[PDB]
Amino acid sequence: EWRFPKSTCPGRSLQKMLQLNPHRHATAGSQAATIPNREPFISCSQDECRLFTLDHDVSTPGAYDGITWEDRSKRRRLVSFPLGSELTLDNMKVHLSGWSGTACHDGKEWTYATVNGPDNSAVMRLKYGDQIRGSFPSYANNILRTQESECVCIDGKCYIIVIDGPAGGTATPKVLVTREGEVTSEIIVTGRNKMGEECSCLATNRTWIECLCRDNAFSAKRPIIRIDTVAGTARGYLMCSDTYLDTPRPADGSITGSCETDGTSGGGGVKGAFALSRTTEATTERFYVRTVSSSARSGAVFYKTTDDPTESNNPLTLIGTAVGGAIPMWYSFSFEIPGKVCDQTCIGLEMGLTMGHQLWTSNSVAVYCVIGDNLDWDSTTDVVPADIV
Amino acid sequence: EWRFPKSTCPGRSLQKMLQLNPHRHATAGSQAATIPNREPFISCSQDECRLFTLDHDVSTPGAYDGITWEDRSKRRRLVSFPLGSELTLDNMKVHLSGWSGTACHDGKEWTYATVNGPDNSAVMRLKYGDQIRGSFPSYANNILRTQESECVCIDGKCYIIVIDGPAGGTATPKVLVTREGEVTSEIIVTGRNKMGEECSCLATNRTWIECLCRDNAFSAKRPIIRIDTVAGTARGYLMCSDTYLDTPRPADGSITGSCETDGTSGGGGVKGAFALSRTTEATTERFYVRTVSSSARSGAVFYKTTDDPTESNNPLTLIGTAVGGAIPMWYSFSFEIPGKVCDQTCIGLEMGLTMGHQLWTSNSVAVYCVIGDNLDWDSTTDVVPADIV
Amino acid sequence: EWRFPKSTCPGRSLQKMLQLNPHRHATAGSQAATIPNREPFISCSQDECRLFTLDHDVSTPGAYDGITWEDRSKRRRLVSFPLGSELTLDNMKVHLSGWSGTACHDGKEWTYATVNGPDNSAVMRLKYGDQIRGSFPSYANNILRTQESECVCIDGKCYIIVIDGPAGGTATPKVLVTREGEVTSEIIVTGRNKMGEECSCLATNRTWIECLCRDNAFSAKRPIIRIDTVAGTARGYLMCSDTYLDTPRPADGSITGSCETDGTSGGGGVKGAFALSRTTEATTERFYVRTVSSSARSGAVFYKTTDDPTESNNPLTLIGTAVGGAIPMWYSFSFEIPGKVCDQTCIGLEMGLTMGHQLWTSNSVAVYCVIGDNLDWDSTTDVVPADIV
Amino acid sequence: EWRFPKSTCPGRSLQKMLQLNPHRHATAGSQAATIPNREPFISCSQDECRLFTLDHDVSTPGAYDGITWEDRSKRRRLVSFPLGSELTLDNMKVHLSGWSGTACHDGKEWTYATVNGPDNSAVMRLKYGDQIRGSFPSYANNILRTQESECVCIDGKCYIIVIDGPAGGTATPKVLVTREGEVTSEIIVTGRNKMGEECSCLATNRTWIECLCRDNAFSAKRPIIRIDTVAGTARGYLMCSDTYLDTPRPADGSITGSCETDGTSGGGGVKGAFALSRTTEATTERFYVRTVSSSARSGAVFYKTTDDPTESNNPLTLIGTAVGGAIPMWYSFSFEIPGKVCDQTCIGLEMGLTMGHQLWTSNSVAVYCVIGDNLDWDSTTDVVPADIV
Ligand SMILES: CC(=O)N[C@H]1[C@H]([C@H](O)[C@H](O)CO)OC(C(=O)O)=C[C@@H]1NC(=N)N
Ligand SMILES: CC(=O)N[C@H]1[C@H]([C@H](O)[C@H](O)CO)OC(C(=O)O)=C[C@@H]1NC(=N)N
Ligand SMILES: CC(=O)N[C@H]1[C@H]([C@H](O)[C@H](O)CO)OC(C(=O)O)=C[C@@H]1NC(=N)N
Ligand SMILES: CC(=O)N[C@H]1[C@H]([C@H](O)[C@H](O)CO)OC(C(=O)O)=C[C@@H]1NC(=N)N
Ligand SMILES: *[C@@H]1O[C@H](CO)[C@@H](O)[C@H](O)[C@H]1NC(C)=O
Ligand SMILES: *[C@@H]1O[C@H](CO)[C@@H](O)[C@H](O)[C@H]1NC(C)=O
Ligand SMILES: *[C@@H]1O[C@H](CO)[C@@H](O)[C@H](O)[C@H]1NC(C)=O
Ligand SMILES: *[C@@H]1O[C@H](CO)[C@@H](O)[C@H](O)[C@H]1NC(C)=O
Ligand SMILES: [Ca+2]
Ligand SMILES: [Ca+2]
Ligand SMILES: [Ca+2]
Ligand SMILES: [Ca+2]
């Protein structure tokens, strides 16, 4: 009936699943209406996985596709594609207008959520199946926004992290608890709770959820939020590892002080992601990604650890380079593929494609999952934005 | 088994669901065969919602798409798209030839209905699943025509409003009662019954239906038709509110006389729409739309009331502007999304796009549903018809 | 379980269902890969109807589409589209290579059949679901060929009419009886059996089938074949009505002699069609089509009769003109839409489109079904082949 | 429940099913995004058959499609199409990145497998439904590679042949045994086991599998591998027939020595295929293909035999020419269509299309299945690569 976390399929590394690269098909002579997009993620039911993303109400090639750099507009929508369908106009399914999104399947129906509206009075609407069942208005009136990756559903309840407030200062996250799309509860995040954008969330055992977030203002360490679904509580932490996962970031281990010390830099950031191995009682291994560059959104390197990331300052263990340092790599996202016997967690990579500042912008999506013993291959796009018609 | 009205999901305002905007993809360089269309509406089964519309047997760009301004021809068909699919040639499904349409799902099968034929001897055909099960010929031999929005099915019977007669004079509506597409009964509309085109209809409780119509000849007040499905009767009224909902219209409250007094103007009009909150016994709130302009089809403003619209001349309560006054806005339509626990009513807006008189004509469709506490955002198209190839 | 004929939904005329017109989308500026085709027909399961046709392994516009006039080649295939999908490359489903075809659903699985091979040694292959279960080689080694419309399945057995032999002389038809695609029996057609191409077949009651065919060599009267599925016998007749249904044809009633007298002309012909009303015991009304012109394939006129067409020379009763005489109209085909409570028979019209002799050739398909009391409207294409890119 | 081999539908020859030819639609004026590809094959579940192939992350026409000659890159993916859908961008479904592939359905879920990674450290990943359940790293670190045709699933276990090692020397094949995508066992191939690439495999009775392979280094005779699924053993043989099936090859019967003697030539080769008739206990007839030319990959000729191909040096019996000798014909592949009453085996032909060395490269796929008594027709492409835009 209801979705719930199982023990994960055994795996000791990350290996490539597939890649979607729609703008390979937007060159001279081509015959495709491709969908430029940003903030992609993947979410799955027991029947099918789907690639979700935020579009701009336009295809490429096309005269209007110059707006695709914008973060927020009346044009953007949360859309999705069956996973493995290329990202073309006829394959696209529109779910909700809005410019920040999340989605997750509870075992019976999809929940889709987007934020729509002006910056100072936006509203999250939650769609359950075909009906808008939930509505959650901005509480700090400064760009209400959510995960840009899948939410987590356990035992008929879904858990969504939202944040509202300045990009350059304190902004308090909230855990929304939904039931058939209705917001039935808000959970206050205690502990280290002054930031936490764009969380990538995965269940760590049968009843707990762990989210890896972005602190855009205070620290190059990523915030971590843990949710106890039985107690209905949430606590924020700062990831303690010397291997800082945000971009931009200082040299590894150079932040002086306790685990929860911000550091002197910390402005700016990017959505990050992780994967894991777990039994029904505990997570036994974690897998992390960060950029190759400590200053630009370029490259992707995988790491792993068997320590608790909220307690240990130990450096992470290098897995290898999944995207070379010369290749733009922007957001990454966590997701889980449910199975009848075991679950599997994965990391998707937003390989960015752009003609430049305030010009055409989109991506290619590469997917790696927890399986095997060594990284198999790195990913490239072989798309030159200059070649896009 | 059979569809029947449930209590609606709680909601105190209208908030945006999604928007379809196919002709964003018909610009120079684009690679899409988009479907120009008019009189769109949405109807849902428990499985899926669908966007229905009347096409012209052509795509845009294309050499033949200059006929898309015509109301009636041998080219038009009732077609549909899964809701959320963009309106392209490969996504389209053709149901019936004809130039006035409606459709509704009874819980087991779709009923589709169109009027086909010459102006003076048209015929409504009703398709149930894959078979044409019903046929209803013109009774006044002057453009038989129907709702251009979904019909209402209760307990295995579907209710369709048709009208026949002059656009500028008395034309008597009829309620057709269908069972598996067969017209089993005609219900005579008593009361105020001299006009009533293009009705948008919703169940007001377990057994009654209310339709909001267009009087093209006599009044800027909209006619309202109520159907008692148990008694098998229908009665027409004139909406009494000072906030007149048709276009063109005089200043609010300036019509002198009783609730049912026409007023001195009243020629012309446009299809209108409403939404509601209801329990199984009674409607508890109504939501209305009208244009911003009192003379042109431009803009869309939402209103609400807890009064009976056939009894109260009280002004409606402003919700806010859903489409700015500088933006063409033509038809609007009511529809209902059925759910397993509650139903939800919505209003769709036909945001018109045209190069001018007897030139290319189509639209974008924005959808708002009853949910939340304040209007979230207004809608735009950002399509300039001059840019369409 | 198994498909079997029910009493037909009540109806006293033919009225338009829909029309497919893919080459409206093949004009300058258009963005569609349309499928040029000939010999279309429709066949239905209880789930969906499908438009079948014979393609040429090409789309229009395209450099190779000049071969679309050919009757037989290694390029042609039996393909199909969900009924209501427009005839584009991405909507097409390929079933079998070959240049003469038929298909019918027995209640459990589709049977598809085509003839493939050279003129002097062609082979019919029969596909049941996904497997080729049947094979029937040419028996006269002179263009084995079949109905170009749906076969008829009763009680798990399907009935297919095939013919082999000269187009200008005696060619003996055979009734093939199939079970899960395997040819289990050949039925010898007795009586008037020297011709009978391209039969359109419908059940006339619970256990009998009637086929309306084309005599390409001897007569402007159409041959009729009746099959008794219980006895497993078939007998050929000549339609006796003064209203001769083939093209070309002499003036009505001018053939002198008995019902089975050929007449002095009779060379050439075209596939024809009929529809009917029936109970479980007997057919009570028949509906026929023929061209407007007695010499060219142009126009379509509907007729009806309550007489036995193998016994009565009475003229048929005019219903009206479904396609005007200035409009090319080639093949027509019979088909039946099964229902849970009643069945419905229909006639489809191949409205031909061509640039001329040995040039680009395709069609538009208009569908009329037995319902109502008067013909609703005639059909046009509004496609000028000169405009096709 | 689980898939297992049944007796095959009776048939004594090979006859054409269908052909897919997407690049007929890539000519001047055409409107299709076609998918250039190589190493196609077909695999079926009880619900549907699917055409699998290895793409290049590009469509034709398009600026990037010049890489389509490459064997291995970071661009290639195992993709599939419902069998009968033409090979266009919107019809394509991406399963796994990689440049050597196989897939097979066990009765419950699809298993997909590809090899990804650099030549010296590639990794096979196995996807079961939506999850990557298996991982198998290169064991000789010299281009791990697999069948390029469907694997065989019996009683919940699937059997995949892999090889690793030099293309010009000894390379040891391994039989991988999978259960829900997990590699549970490796079976050592005994006997003649120094080569065996690109095996086409079919069950020969209820419990045994026979694979027809390519020896790229030692012999023009094809290796044959038999798997006993009950004992869990595999043994390699050399096909003994004087009618040598590989290309290039010496004159028939001119290899001097025993059945297992290599011969003095033997360098180079091509993937080959066979089909069969079987009961639940034994194979009763085998059908083989080879090229017309003994030196180039051109043409296709069918043969048959009732002898054991590992024991008899008897020449095979000619069936006839399926593709004329002037037409390029590259890989061929075995596959089986499961049925409820009987199974059917088939051979697909990769009819190659290329502009030349290190230029655009793709194919057309023709399918022949075991049915009937004589070959019905040969196949052509009528695609001139010079005409491709
Ligand atoms: C709601 C919103 O606009 N979110 C922004 C996000 C945001 O600016 C930062 O996290 C600071 O708050 O940054 C960026 C980014 O690329 O850094 C993309 C996101 N765009 C979208 N999700 N449409
Ligand atoms: C059957 C028919 O032609 N209905 C007309 C409708 C009609 O003219 C008026 O209501 C007056 O009767 O007006 C208009 C309109 O835009 O005002 C569109 C509709 N077009 C279509 N439904 N095709
Ligand atoms: C097998 C075959 O070629 N059948 C022909 C058919 C035939 O020539 C006549 O009936 C005389 O035998 O005529 C014509 C026609 O338009 O008259 C189309 C059919 N074309 C196809 N079914 N491909
Ligand atoms: C893994 C790999 O590259 N396999 C090659 C294959 C291989 O080179 C030979 O068998 C020698 O080992 O040959 C060829 C070929 O056309 O001969 C295509 C295959 N290409 C692909 N399967 N992508
Ligand atoms: C999951 O982990 C948390 C934190 O360690 C623990 O409190 C909880 O009991 C665990 N749940 C189960 C079902 O073991
Ligand atoms: C619905 O409302 C009508 C009008 O007020 C009323 O007559 C009828 O009884 C109501 N139906 C139910 C089931 O309460
Ligand atoms: C169908 O009609 C035929 C011919 O009139 C007749 O012989 C047969 O009995 C009828 N079948 C049934 C079931 O009535
Ligand atoms: C299948 O054939 C093999 C080899 O001849 C034989 O050993 C085995 O017993 C056969 N299986 C069955 C089920 O007959
Ligand atoms: Ca930061
Ligand atoms: Ca009015
Ligand atoms: Ca004739
Ligand atoms: Ca060799």
Tab-separated table of C-alpha atoms in Angstrom, chain A residues 140-323:
chain	number	residue	atom	x	y	z
A	140	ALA	CA	8.506	35.605	5.366
A	141	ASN	CA	7.380	37.247	2.120
A	142	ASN	CA	10.819	36.936	0.524
A	143	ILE	CA	10.808	34.234	-2.198
A	144	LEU	CA	9.198	31.173	-0.665
A	145	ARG	CA	11.031	28.251	-2.255
A	146	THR	CA	11.535	24.515	-1.884
A	147	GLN	CA	13.830	21.573	-2.651
A	148	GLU	CA	14.139	21.316	-6.480
A	149	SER	CA	14.369	17.565	-5.814
A	150	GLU	CA	11.945	14.879	-4.720
A	151	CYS	CA	10.208	14.932	-1.383
A	152	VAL	CA	10.091	11.838	0.841
A	153	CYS	CA	6.873	9.915	1.584
A	154	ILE	CA	6.659	7.464	4.499
A	155	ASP	CA	3.483	5.628	5.620
A	156	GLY	CA	1.095	7.919	3.738
A	157	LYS	CA	2.743	11.175	4.845
A	158	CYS	CA	5.081	13.233	2.663
A	159	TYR	CA	7.802	15.534	3.979
A	160	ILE	CA	8.758	18.713	2.110
A	161	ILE	CA	11.402	21.235	3.152
A	162	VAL	CA	10.572	24.866	2.378
A	163	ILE	CA	12.482	28.071	3.130
A	164	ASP	CA	11.535	31.766	3.020
A	165	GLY	CA	13.705	34.815	3.631
A	166	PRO	CA	16.780	36.590	2.278
A	167	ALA	CA	19.248	34.753	0.068
A	168	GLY	CA	22.089	36.564	1.841
A	169	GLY	CA	20.994	36.168	5.449
A	170	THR	CA	19.017	34.156	7.973
A	171	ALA	CA	16.154	32.207	6.419
A	172	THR	CA	14.338	29.646	8.525
A	173	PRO	CA	13.457	26.302	6.919
A	174	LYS	CA	10.251	24.471	7.769
A	175	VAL	CA	9.289	20.837	7.274
A	176	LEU	CA	5.792	20.540	5.833
A	177	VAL	CA	3.950	17.284	6.481
A	178	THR	CA	1.337	16.441	3.850
A	179	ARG	CA	-1.395	13.802	3.572
A	180	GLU	CA	-3.049	13.501	0.137
A	181	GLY	CA	-1.536	16.894	-0.731
A	182	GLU	CA	-3.019	18.647	2.328
A	183	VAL	CA	-0.523	20.337	4.665
A	184	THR	CA	-1.496	18.762	7.980
A	185	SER	CA	1.488	19.861	10.067
A	186	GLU	CA	4.487	22.194	10.097
A	187	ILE	CA	7.575	20.881	11.879
A	188	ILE	CA	9.916	23.455	13.388
A	189	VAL	CA	13.564	22.800	12.604
A	190	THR	CA	15.528	23.144	15.832
A	191	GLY	CA	19.301	23.275	16.320
A	192	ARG	CA	21.362	24.847	13.528
A	193	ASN	CA	18.468	26.372	11.617
A	194	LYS	CA	19.486	29.741	10.126
A	195	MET	CA	19.700	28.471	6.530
A	196	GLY	CA	19.037	25.416	4.414
A	197	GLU	CA	17.962	25.846	0.813
A	198	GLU	CA	17.326	23.264	-1.879
A	199	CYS	CA	17.564	20.188	0.345
A	200	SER	CA	18.236	16.758	-1.160
A	201	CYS	CA	16.480	14.272	1.132
A	202	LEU	CA	16.629	10.501	1.616
A	203	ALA	CA	15.326	8.152	4.274
A	204	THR	CA	18.150	6.888	6.496
A	205	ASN	CA	16.118	3.983	7.924
A	206	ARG	CA	12.508	2.907	8.375
A	207	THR	CA	11.438	6.117	10.153
A	208	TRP	CA	14.060	8.894	9.758
A	209	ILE	CA	14.893	11.258	6.883
A	210	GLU	CA	18.176	13.104	6.294
A	211	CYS	CA	18.419	16.203	4.087
A	212	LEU	CA	21.583	17.744	2.642
A	213	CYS	CA	21.070	21.435	1.990
A	214	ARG	CA	22.663	24.685	0.790
A	215	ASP	CA	23.637	27.528	3.127
A	216	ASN	CA	23.756	30.456	0.711
A	217	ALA	CA	24.938	32.993	3.243
A	218	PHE	CA	27.035	31.729	6.138
A	219	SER	CA	29.159	28.679	5.383
A	220	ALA	CA	30.779	26.399	2.801
A	221	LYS	CA	29.751	23.463	4.997
A	222	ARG	CA	26.438	22.075	3.996
A	223	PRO	CA	23.561	22.093	6.498
A	224	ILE	CA	22.023	18.719	7.313
A	225	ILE	CA	18.445	18.340	8.554
A	226	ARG	CA	17.212	15.136	10.188
A	227	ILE	CA	13.510	14.364	10.528
A	228	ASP	CA	12.083	11.848	12.992
A	229	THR	CA	8.747	10.925	11.407
A	230	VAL	CA	7.556	9.031	14.511
A	231	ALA	CA	8.249	11.839	16.982
A	232	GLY	CA	7.411	14.464	14.345
A	233	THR	CA	10.546	16.525	15.013
A	234	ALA	CA	13.370	17.984	12.938
A	235	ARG	CA	16.859	19.169	13.888
A	236	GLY	CA	19.437	21.055	11.853
A	237	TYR	CA	23.174	20.388	11.855
A	238	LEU	CA	26.229	21.507	9.946
A	239	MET	CA	28.158	18.809	8.082
A	240	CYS	CA	31.444	18.568	9.965
A	241	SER	CA	33.750	16.902	7.410
A	242	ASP	CA	36.941	18.692	6.372
A	243	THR	CA	35.792	17.902	2.793
A	244	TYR	CA	33.457	20.877	2.366
A	245	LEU	CA	30.792	20.158	-0.202
A	246	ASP	CA	29.515	23.595	-1.259
A	247	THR	CA	30.816	25.875	-4.046
A	248	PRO	CA	32.481	28.331	-3.562
A	249	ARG	CA	34.502	26.972	-0.625
A	250	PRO	CA	37.891	27.440	1.073
A	251	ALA	CA	40.605	24.789	1.135
A	252	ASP	CA	39.639	21.515	2.816
A	253	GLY	CA	39.940	21.581	6.589
A	254	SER	CA	40.844	25.276	6.712
A	255	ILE	CA	37.677	26.332	8.603
A	256	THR	CA	38.815	26.852	12.190
A	257	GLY	CA	36.566	25.989	15.124
A	258	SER	CA	33.922	23.487	16.123
A	259	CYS	CA	31.808	21.329	13.826
A	260	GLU	CA	29.079	23.988	13.812
A	261	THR	CA	31.418	26.945	13.150
A	262	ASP	CA	30.435	28.794	9.957
A	263	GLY	CA	33.825	29.983	8.773
A	264	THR	CA	34.750	33.439	7.540
A	265	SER	CA	33.628	33.021	3.913
A	266	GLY	CA	30.450	31.114	3.062
A	267	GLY	CA	28.547	33.449	0.737
A	268	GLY	CA	26.939	31.818	-2.283
A	269	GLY	CA	26.386	28.144	-2.900
A	270	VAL	CA	24.797	25.476	-5.061
A	271	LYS	CA	22.329	22.653	-4.511
A	272	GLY	CA	24.159	19.474	-3.517
A	273	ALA	CA	23.306	15.811	-3.205
A	274	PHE	CA	24.177	12.485	-1.597
A	275	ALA	CA	23.287	8.793	-1.736
A	276	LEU	CA	23.511	6.032	0.850
A	277	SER	CA	23.364	2.397	1.865
A	278	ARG	CA	20.989	1.531	4.697
A	279	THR	CA	19.292	-1.322	6.481
A	280	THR	CA	15.870	-0.922	8.056
A	281	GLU	CA	17.563	0.416	11.221
A	282	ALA	CA	20.552	2.523	10.171
A	283	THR	CA	22.505	4.077	7.345
A	284	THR	CA	25.799	2.216	6.854
A	285	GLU	CA	27.524	4.294	4.150
A	286	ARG	CA	27.091	7.714	2.541
A	287	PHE	CA	28.144	8.922	-0.900
A	288	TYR	CA	28.689	12.599	-1.655
A	289	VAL	CA	29.305	14.813	-4.658
A	290	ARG	CA	30.973	18.184	-4.980
A	291	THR	CA	32.426	20.230	-7.802
A	292	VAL	CA	36.018	19.879	-8.995
A	293	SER	CA	36.552	23.634	-8.714
A	294	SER	CA	36.447	25.303	-5.316
A	295	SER	CA	35.294	28.567	-6.899
A	296	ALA	CA	33.198	27.751	-9.997
A	297	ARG	CA	30.352	25.329	-10.742
A	298	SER	CA	32.504	22.981	-12.799
A	299	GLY	CA	33.225	19.276	-12.539
A	300	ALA	CA	31.864	16.638	-10.181
A	301	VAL	CA	33.795	14.404	-7.790
A	302	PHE	CA	32.289	11.549	-5.770
A	303	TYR	CA	33.270	10.782	-2.166
A	304	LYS	CA	32.084	8.310	0.471
A	305	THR	CA	32.177	7.805	4.232
A	306	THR	CA	30.999	5.401	6.925
A	307	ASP	CA	31.120	8.112	9.647
A	308	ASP	CA	28.221	10.225	10.926
A	309	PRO	CA	28.470	13.465	8.882
A	310	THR	CA	27.135	15.573	11.793
A	311	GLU	CA	29.783	14.294	14.241
A	312	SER	CA	33.034	13.594	12.374
A	313	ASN	CA	35.444	16.128	10.889
A	314	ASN	CA	37.308	13.311	9.115
A	315	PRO	CA	37.962	13.916	5.409
A	316	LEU	CA	35.764	11.934	3.047
A	317	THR	CA	37.172	9.088	0.946
A	318	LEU	CA	37.698	9.857	-2.737
A	319	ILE	CA	35.726	7.728	-5.191
A	320	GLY	CA	36.746	9.549	-8.361
A	321	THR	CA	35.873	12.183	-10.934
A	322	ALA	CA	32.417	11.772	-12.494
A	323	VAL	CA	32.546	14.988	-14.548
